[PDB]
Amino acid sequence: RGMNHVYLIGALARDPELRYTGNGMAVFEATVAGEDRVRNLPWYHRVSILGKPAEWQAERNLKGGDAVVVEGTLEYRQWEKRSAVNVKALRMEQLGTQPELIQDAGGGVRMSGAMNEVLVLGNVTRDPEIRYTPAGDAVLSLSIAVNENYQDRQGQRQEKVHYIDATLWRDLAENMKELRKGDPVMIMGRLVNEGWTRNSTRVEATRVEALAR
Amino acid sequence: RGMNHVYLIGALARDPELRYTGNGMAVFEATVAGEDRVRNLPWYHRVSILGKPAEWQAERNLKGGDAVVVEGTLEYRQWEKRSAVNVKALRMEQLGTQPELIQDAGGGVRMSGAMNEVLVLGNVTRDPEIRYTPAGDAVLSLSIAVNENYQDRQGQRQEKVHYIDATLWRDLAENMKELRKGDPVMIMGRLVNEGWTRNSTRVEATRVEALAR
């Protein structure tokens, strides 16, 4: 139970990198960047692939400016507390068509006519926070727990949690403001980066469904 | 003999990363970014620190938006051929003042009122290429070899070469167009990235001195 899906079509903002962790694990890192018509809103997301798949991807030798499709999951990480959500994939696929690129001052590029979709299903972790813009537009910050099963070194089942933050606007905010900790919910939207004082990767919701309690 | 110096004052364009090579060597990577009044011309340069110094720097926990001073060298690398020049440092130092930052669409930042200086001294590797813009401004592409001594694992002296490309404009181009392979030369200028069809880190010369042959 619980869903965790991200689909991106974007340009590699610059050449990806293959490196290693302190433990010797391969990590392939690329920034995928786009803007979708939904104003033209830009996004840039770091995508990581780990282990042998990282080496396999690196071998494909994709470069900055290449358009890719990526299927991935949102990965929550926590350290000393501070936290971040990033996109994890197993592979990307290069598009056969040549994207229309927009160059930024850093020499980074993004793809016009991109795609950015998230589908997550989990449970609310805490009573949500409702606020209003000065003009009276509702905004609700909602945090959900997405549970992942995995097998450790011993072959015993373990659980991992990803805490995913979502931003709901206007009617979506008003409709979901009565959600409570523990309530199951499904959220569809786009993956965005929201700046604060700090960075936060969030889901800007386009559709939300409270699930049967 | 031979000089290889880069001085940068800029903002970290985003959070730096500590990673490792396939051989387990620590590599600290940061992008330092600025624009200097000399129009306001932006630059973004990847700076690398290797080994224990990389770990030491990572411990300082500098973040995107922090202003730094970096003293470094230009490092030439070659693979299968293709090549790149990057900035190598042993440490950066954070400024005590808060920079005026300019944000790009990628969420990257650069520092206004930055500093970017290169001093190199080596020998011309090949007869230089002179071209003219349509309006008749001279441009000379000049490549020099900068020789570095080092000790290998056995304690024997070895040499390493860095091939550095420079762009000379107008009077500087006309003045230096008679340079020949082997001629010693000193070049001062700013480190830039020049796009082509590909990326090239080059020295845009502000002063050049032919040395006694």
Side-chain angles (χ1 to χ4, degrees):
Chain A
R1 201 207 146 256
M3 289 187 24
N4 188 351
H5 299 119
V6 187
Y7 304 100
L8 301 179
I9 301 173
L12 301 179
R14 65 201 75 95
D15 290 345
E17 288 199 356
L18 179 71
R19 300 282 185 277
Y20 299 82
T21 65
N23 266 66
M25 172 169 90
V27 181
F28 176 92
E29 283 158 302
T31 295
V32 181
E35 51 174 61
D36 356 279
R37 54 189 332 194
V38 130
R39 327 169 150 174
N40 273 306
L41 212 18
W43 48 266
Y44 293 68
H45 295 297
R46 299 201 118 86
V47 174
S48 302
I49 303 170
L50 317 163
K52 290 302 166 186
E55 308 196 321
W56 299 336
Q57 184 58 47
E59 292 180 333
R60 284 159 203 135
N61 206 38
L62 297 186
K63 319 171 275 102
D66 286 348
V68 296
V69 57
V70 175
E71 150 186 70
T73 60
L74 301 176
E75 206 92 79
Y76 171 86
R77 87 194 157 174
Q78 196 184 292
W79 66 96
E80 25 279 285
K81 288 161 201 220
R82 300 251 195 281
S83 72
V85 170
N86 70 283
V87 181
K88 177 184 195 171
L90 289 165
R91 70 198 78 81
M92 345 173 104
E93 318 287 352
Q94 188 184 7
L95 303 194
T97 185
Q98 39 284 295
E100 292 295 281
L101 303 167
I102 297 151
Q103 210 171 102
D104 64 56
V109 296
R110 63 179 186 275
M111 192 180 144
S112 63
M115 187 183 78
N116 179 344
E117 179 171 6
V118 178
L119 304 92
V120 292
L121 190 156
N123 300 74
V124 177
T125 66
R126 55 181 89 112
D127 282 14
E129 154 185 30
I130 194 134
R131 301 279 180 272
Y132 291 84
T133 70
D137 289 314
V139 60
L140 187 78
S141 302
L142 183 64
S143 300
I144 65 155
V146 177
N147 197 123
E148 183 192 347
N149 287 329
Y150 72 93
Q151 305 292 303
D152 60 26
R153 64 165 74 186
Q154 305 208 325
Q156 305 306 287
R157 195 182 131 239
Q158 301 296 356
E159 288 174 13
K160 186 176 215 270
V161 63
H162 304 104
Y163 301 103
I164 306 302
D165 299 304
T167 298
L168 283 57
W169 286 92
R170 293 177 285 282
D171 290 330
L172 273 69
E174 294 288 7
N175 289 349
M176 296 299 280
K177 71 174 174 308
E178 300 305 325
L179 282 173
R180 287 314 173 240
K181 181 183 188 194
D183 289 351
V185 63
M186 198 200 69
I187 300 173
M188 288 155 33
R190 56 190 290 264
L191 199 69
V192 301
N193 287 303
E194 278 173 37
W196 61 289
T197 305
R198 285 242 219 152
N199 201 333
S200 287
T201 298
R202 297 199 89 184
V203 179
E204 185 182 276
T206 55
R207 182 176 180 150
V208 184
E209 303 291 343
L211 300 184
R213 313 202 284 166
Chain B
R1 201 207 146 256
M3 289 187 24
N4 188 351
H5 299 119
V6 187
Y7 304 100
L8 301 179
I9 301 173
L12 301 179
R14 65 201 75 95
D15 290 345
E17 288 199 356
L18 179 71
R19 300 282 185 277
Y20 299 82
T21 65
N23 266 66
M25 172 169 90
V27 181
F28 176 92
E29 283 158 302
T31 295
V32 181
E35 51 174 61
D36 356 279
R37 54 189 332 194
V38 130
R39 327 169 150 174
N40 273 306
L41 212 18
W43 48 266
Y44 293 68
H45 295 297
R46 299 201 118 86
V47 174
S48 302
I49 303 170
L50 317 163
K52 290 302 166 186
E55 308 196 321
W56 299 336
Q57 184 58 47
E59 292 180 333
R60 284 159 203 135
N61 206 38
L62 297 186
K63 319 171 275 102
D66 286 348
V68 296
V69 57
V70 175
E71 150 186 70
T73 60
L74 301 176
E75 206 92 79
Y76 171 86
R77 87 194 157 174
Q78 196 184 292
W79 66 96
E80 25 279 285
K81 288 161 201 220
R82 300 251 195 281
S83 72
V85 170
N86 70 283
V87 181
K88 177 184 195 171
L90 289 165
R91 70 198 78 81
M92 345 173 104
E93 318 287 352
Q94 188 184 7
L95 303 194
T97 185
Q98 39 284 295
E100 292 295 281
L101 303 167
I102 297 151
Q103 210 171 102
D104 64 56
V109 296
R110 63 179 186 275
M111 192 180 144
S112 63
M115 187 183 78
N116 179 344
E117 179 171 6
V118 178
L119 304 92
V120 292
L121 190 156
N123 300 74
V124 177
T125 66
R126 55 181 89 112
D127 282 14
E129 154 185 30
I130 194 134
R131 301 279 180 272
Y132 291 84
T133 70
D137 289 314
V139 60
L140 187 78
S141 302
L142 183 64
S143 300
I144 65 155
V146 177
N147 197 123
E148 183 192 347
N149 287 329
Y150 72 93
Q151 305 292 303
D152 60 26
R153 64 165 74 186
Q154 305 208 325
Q156 305 306 287
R157 195 182 131 239
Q158 301 296 356
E159 288 174 13
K160 186 176 215 270
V161 63
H162 304 104
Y163 301 103
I164 306 302
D165 299 304
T167 298
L168 283 57
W169 286 92
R170 293 177 285 282
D171 290 330
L172 273 69
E174 294 288 7
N175 289 349
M176 296 299 280
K177 71 174 174 308
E178 300 305 325
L179 282 173
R180 287 314 173 240
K181 181 183 188 194
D183 289 351
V185 63
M186 198 200 69
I187 300 173
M188 288 155 33
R190 56 190 290 264
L191 199 69
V192 301
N193 287 303
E194 278 173 37
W196 61 289
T197 305
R198 285 242 219 152
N199 201 333
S200 287
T201 298
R202 297 199 89 184
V203 179
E204 185 182 276
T206 55
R207 182 176 180 150
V208 184
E209 303 291 343
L211 300 184
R213 313 202 284 166

